[PDB]
């Protein structure tokens, strides 16, 4: 659950290392295609909030400040429309 | 400093040595000697340690996403 209220600092370090290796060993278009499927949308809602836009801004800035970008373009589109 | 720079680039040439008869004579020599050898050898270890591939020009094809922050 990507939220600064719940997760500790080591949890963000763990998620950063995990997603950096996931973006490394398989491609960012393939990572976006894996995260963008309709079947696993209830399984990514704690990771990709799209609700309470302070938390959505935190998730967008988190995935940008890791060094990824890209994955949060749909979340940036959803934030910009609201 | 520009005049000294002109004399300095006039100094730094190849100038392959003349065969000199007799004993050799010491010519004009330096750098920062007191205490800078530690950071100099640290720079040597960093140069032996740092690994980076490709050309130096790699800033192209970067979307460069900025942080949204808060209003």
């Amino acid at each position: 659950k990507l939220s600064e209220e719940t997760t500790t600092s080591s949890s963000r370090i763990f998620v950063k290392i995990f997603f950096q290796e996931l973006c490394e060993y398989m491609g960012l278009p393939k990572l976006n295609a894996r995260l963008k499927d309709e079947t696993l949308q209830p399984f990514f809602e704690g990771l990709l909030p799209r609700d309470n836009p302070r938390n959505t801004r935190f998730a967008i800035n988190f995935f940008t400040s890791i060094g990824l970008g890209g994955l949060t373009d749909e979340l940036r589109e959803h934030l910009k429309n609201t | 400093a520009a005049g000294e720079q002109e004399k300095l680039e006039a100094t730094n040439r190849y100038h392959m040595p003349k065969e000199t008869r007799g004993q050799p004579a010491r010519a004009v020599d330096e750098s920062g000697a007191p205490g800078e050898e530690q950071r100099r050898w640290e720079e040597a270890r960093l140069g032996a340690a740092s690994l980076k591939f490709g050309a130096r020009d790699a800033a192209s094809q970067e979307p460069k996403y900025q942080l949204v922050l808060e209003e």
Partner: peptide
């Protein structure tokens, strides 16, 4: 060495510190 370990985790990869640095860059 728990205190030095929390010092290393506050000096870790730390996206929160990047948020703080970019917020002070944008504010000032």
């Amino acid at each position: 060495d728990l205190d030095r370990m929390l010092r290393e985790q506050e000096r870790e990869g730390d996206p929160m510190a990047n948020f703080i640095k970019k917020n002070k860059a944008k504010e000032n």
